[PDB]
């Protein structure tokens, strides 16, 4: 970890008024420092151990930015706020202490590699606290990543909440919405084209335009590749102003037009506000 | 292992083949192409290409060396096909500059009657034997036979120990030497008449009669006496297997008197094209095969026809009432 | 589609040690030329890798020759040349002789007369070679009269 | 995309002791150039056919950072990685190849309108690999965020996990939290205020201190907004130290109170930990 | 591997004397070849990948299909991404690897193969490392009959002459007026031979138990059998000739062959290709 000081400026009252080279002599040292933390944030800091971020293979800036790499050495000190870190515990589990923080603090860091496992766990020490977590949290996800943010400094008290997440994978929704069933008292739309999963979960939740009849039920579909189609699960029936044991409220049907997995949700209630939203999905690739 | 393994040849004769037929395509006016030759680049390869052993770069092929060498072009001239021959490399009996005069190998090629030492008959053009047989006595190309015999039974080549004796003589279609006595026989082919001989004939390359050209006279190269049993025949090049065709052209300073004029560096490279359109001045015109012997290069189309091969020299200086001669040869 | 030829004579014209003029012949026209060291000795035995020895280029180059000062002194190096230029096969990849650039070799030259040097300046600026001991174009110098 | 050099550093033994305007006439070069990339990463690089990224119309920094617009021409060439994109594929499907990365290395891109589809692919090659994509990704989603990490570099071999996400919608969990069930046996735990979802599910788990008893169902609840209930469906019911088939190592009951879903999990167990986490919710909004 | 062959007169002979069977060849079924490769075929390396100057079939199969109702595209790719690898070692610019002119090997794949009638397409504007010159789109019933997956077929100027169109050469440009000279610019050095061997011209060879034929010869301008031999000559017309109804050694064979024993049979339909490289 290069260390990097604040920003530091220079005397424009200098130089053509006072001697030029001195106070020059002055400026270089803090630009150069200057955009050393610039550089030793977006690029690594062992690029330093190099020209010292200087040469073609000097510190790049990442619009991105830069998970700074080091050893555990380095994180064997109370790592300061808001620095990206990646470091990869193949080699051992390892504490990441962290100073105390402020309201507001953040500490970024992942595994790229995601060698993180319980055999590869990942201590952290946020000074007084980080809530949630009483004393030091372990960390044994692969691919995780490493947020810390100071909820609370005040006084001696710095409280980290503390997100995580797996640094890969589809998490997208293909379709969420909202709109309002139709005169007609239905409509059919698009979910996602047909071929991007062959499994989805969507929750529907059909309510009058004055909001006592409210429909809801569990929407499971297995997408049909061969036949184009789509199959259903509804069970977990809820509703609110169900006149009806039956079908009430609106009707949820489905299908598969444009290229798009289409749903077709038909209330004969008109002025029923339709909220379509696709909580979760599959798709299936390669092996391996 | 690999299943499938299998051979496969041509013959040496389909060289001639090929240029019995380019020698077809040559046409006058129509569909068939027409040859214009020309030279450039004034300019010059480099300070150097006055001294010796200065070797000019390597001719560049190209859209790009086309244009170039399109570029300096000085003149270009046409080829007619009576121009081109078929042509093997001449060897005469008895001649001393070459070596091993007396001594020949099996289907060598003797040409009498070229030369006085080897004039054998007065009032006869050249002949043309071919020698089938060589003394027993020799030596073996593959070193492990001594016999010239069992040599050949492998056929390796065979180098005979003696000498010839004479140039071989008669019209006579075996007719090497056979009764009285020697080592080496010989097979006659045809005469070549003096005319021809003194005007084509390079002493390293005797010109070889067309089959076309024959079946005008087969008398005036000899060959009408012969034996053929196919009838007319007149294919001989075939049995000579002739792979050679000369290009021969005459350059002469008066249809390019400017790239002659006095203090001209010459041209440095050489560039032959086949089917050149005429210049038009309008684009839409429908274009024109080249009649005329030499065109400046501007009364040509850019570009027009293509050129197979080009040619980077050091500089040659043409002169005016010099007249130069360019010849060109190709084995298919 | 046929090679670029070669270089013809083809050699180092002088030895001042950790530097060569070598000189190839100029061969075609606007042919540049692919000259190469390789190593002969790892300084561990010699022509340790007779073959399989690393190459190291200078680059294609222009004209008939090319002036290059670099590594150790006293060294073994080949060094091989090939000819090329646009459209072509490549050259051959001639190899010379090579040699061993001895010890210290320096410099002896002219001057204007008068001038009289110091000698630990070339004994270290040239006989060392050390560039370091004055970069001179960059450098500031004091000149100063004399009691 | 504008190029910039990595840190590029002033000479102080410079200046004051030699000449004062050559050697700053380097280091300007240096400066100038040295911000570049600091604007060019957090501002548009077309700003630099402006004013060069000078003026008041020249390139910013952006604490979010900026994802750099350009034409696919610039993106016909590898593109380093470190880099924040934005592209969107309505023109066409195109794609971005990527140089070799390190492993750590990033590559942050979106489609910001979300024109991305089937009918504009996004289509990237990182050299040698992309972890899970056998040749180069294409990317149909519209609001996607493409971000490549480098979790493999070693040598030749350039191994991309993959990341994307859709750049909008509702991520958050209302409720998640974990807490031991009272010698009350139960507690009432504000879930969240009652307007914010029409649905929600959770997962609660009712664990003994000792851990053998621990208790688990499938939550699915209705919000009822007119009777300011909420409407429960529970199924696919598993225990492990349940001794009785009946409701067994805990209950679970719901209600609304202080403007808050409330959950109310008694077990006539004590000691048992319950962790309540709200996985999926729904709200209905506006129609379209 | 059969005996490496020999050409002499008494090569001639024996093969002239065992030669069980003769075939003609019309003109049509000589046609211009040049190796070919489609755009994206997976099993074949860097199917993704192209050099300068390389010709590109479009349109072949469904993985190369961009467009359907079009026979065959040809394609040349002018210009290829510039990162990539240079042939000379020495060089790391595609450039300058070029502008010395040693070979260079590009980094990027194409994306999708090249589209358009126009000239240099490339996929230039929007983006690419490629661009795409065109040439003339192959009409699909002579692609199927004629195309080896190997070897596309190139057509003849004189067939060009014909129809520009159903060779998609039509649409361009030459400037020249006709030009039709095509088989310039995609040099095509190699001419395919087609023939077509049948057990019912020749039954007594594809009668049950041949060890079938070892070796190959063509021959040129045989004559016909007389029995006169003062007769006048005759050149051969028909499809085939038993060796019997050829005159001895009558007409040139260029190419002699030998190949380990293949066995005909009858109703079997046996097939050459043969191809020279001028």
């Not at chain 1, 530091?8 to 001195?22: F, M, V, W």
């Not at chain 1, 943010?149 to 001696?156: A, G, H, L, P």
């Not at chain 3, 008068?114 to 001991?133: G, H, P, R, V």
Request: hydrophobic residues 35%.
């Amino acid at each position: 970890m290069f260390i990097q000081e604040p920003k530091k400026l220079i005397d424009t009252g200098e130089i053509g008024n006072a001697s030029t080279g001195d106070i020059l002599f002055d400026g270089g040292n803090k630009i150069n420092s200057d955009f050393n933390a610039i550089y030793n944030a977006f690029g690594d800091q062992r690029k330093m151990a190099v020209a010292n971020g200087t040469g073609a293979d000097g510190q790049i800036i990442h619009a991105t930015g830069y998970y700074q790499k080091h050893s555990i050495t380095e994180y064997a000190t109370p790592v300061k706020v808001g620095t990206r870190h990646d470091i990869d515990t193949s080699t051992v589990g390892v504490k990441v202490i962290i100073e105390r923080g402020e309201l507001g603090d953040c500490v970024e860091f992942i595994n790229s590699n995601g060698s993180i496992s319980v055999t590869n766990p990942l201590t952290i020490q946020a000074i007084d606290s980080i809530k949630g977590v009483s004393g030091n949290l372990v960390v044994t996800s692969p691919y995780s990543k490493v947020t810390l943010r100071c909820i609370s400094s005040d006084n001696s008290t710095s409280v980290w909440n503390y997100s995580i997440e797996s640094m890969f994978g589809q998490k997208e929704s293909p379709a969420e919405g909202t709109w309002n069933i139709s005169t007609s008292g239905s409509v059919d739309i698009p979910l996602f084209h047909r071929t991007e999963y062959n499994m989805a979960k969507l929750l529907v939740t059909c309510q009058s335009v004055d909001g006592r009849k409210i429909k809801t039920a569990e929407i499971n579909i297995l997408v049909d590749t061969v036949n184009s189609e789509v199959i259903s699960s509804e069970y977990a029936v809820m509703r609110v102003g169900n006149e009806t044991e039956e079908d009430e409220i609106a009707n949820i049907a489905f299908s598969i037009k444009e290229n798009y997995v289409t749903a077709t949700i038909s209330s004969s209630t008109v002025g029923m506000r339709a909220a379509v939203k696709v909580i979760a999905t599959q798709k299936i690739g390669v092996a391996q | 292992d690999s299943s499938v393994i299998y051979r496969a040849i041509v013959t040496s004769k389909f060289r001639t083949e090929k240029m019995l037929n380019f020698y077809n395509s040559i046409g006058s006016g129509p569909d068939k192409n027409t040859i214009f030759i020309t030279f450039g680049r004034s300019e010059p390869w480099s300070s150097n290409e006055n001294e010796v052993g200065f070797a000019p770069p390597y001719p560049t092929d190209s859209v790009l060396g086309v244009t170039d060498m399109w570029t300096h072009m000085m003149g270009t001239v046409k080829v007619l096909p009576s121009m081109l021959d078929a042509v093997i490399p001449r060897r005469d009996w008895g001649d001393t500059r070459y070596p091993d005069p007396y001594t020949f190998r099996i289907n060598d090629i003797v040409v009498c009657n070229s030369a006085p030492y080897n004039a054998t008959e007065s009032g006869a053009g050249w002949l043309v034997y071919r020698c089938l047989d060589v003394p027993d006595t020799g030596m073996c190309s593959i070193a492990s036979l001594t016999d010239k015999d069992e040599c050949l039974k492998l056929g390796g080549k065979w180098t005979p120990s003696a000498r010839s004796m004479t140039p071989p003589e008669g019209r006579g279609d075996a007719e090497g030497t056979i009764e009285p006595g020697d080592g080496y026989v010989w097979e006659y082919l045809f005469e070549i008449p003096p005319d021809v001989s003194i005007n084509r004939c390079t002493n390293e390359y005797i010109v070889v009669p067309w089959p076309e050209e024959l079946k005008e006279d087969p008398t005036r190269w000899g060959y009408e006496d012969n034996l053929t049993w196919q009838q007319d025949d007149f294919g001989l090049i075939y049995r000579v297997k002739a792979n050679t065709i000369r290009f021969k052209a005459y350059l002469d300073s008066v249809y390019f008197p400017e790239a002659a004029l006095p203090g001209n560096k010459g041209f440095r490279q050489i560039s032959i094209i086949t089917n050149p359109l005429e210049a038009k001045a309008h684009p839409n015109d429908p274009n024109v095969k080249a009649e005329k012997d030499y065109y400046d290069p501007e009364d040509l189309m850019r570009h027009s026809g293509e050129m197979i091969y080009m040619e980077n020299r050091p500089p040659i200086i043409m002169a005016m009432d010099q007249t130069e001669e360019i010849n060109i040869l190709f084995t298919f | 589609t046929v090679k670029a030829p070669s270089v013809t004579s083809l050699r180092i014209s002088k030895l001042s040690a950790n530097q060569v003029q070598v000189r190839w012949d100029d061969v075609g026209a606007n042919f540049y030329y692919f000259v190469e060291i390789a190593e002969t000795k790892t300084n561990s035995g010699e022509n340790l890798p007779s073959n399989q020895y690393r190459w190291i280029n200078l680059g294609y180059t222009a004209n008939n020759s090319f002036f290059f000062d670099d590594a150790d002194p006293l060294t073994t190096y080949i060094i091989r040349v090939a000819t090329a230029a646009q459209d072509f096969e490549q050259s051959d990849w001639i190899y010379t002789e090579e040699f061993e650039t001895f010890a210290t070799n320096a410099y002896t030259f002219q001057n204007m007369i008068e001038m009289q040097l110091a000698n630990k300046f070339i004994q270290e600026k040239f006989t060392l070679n050390n560039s370091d001991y004055v970069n001179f174009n960059n450098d500031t110098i004091m000149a100063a009269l004399m009691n």
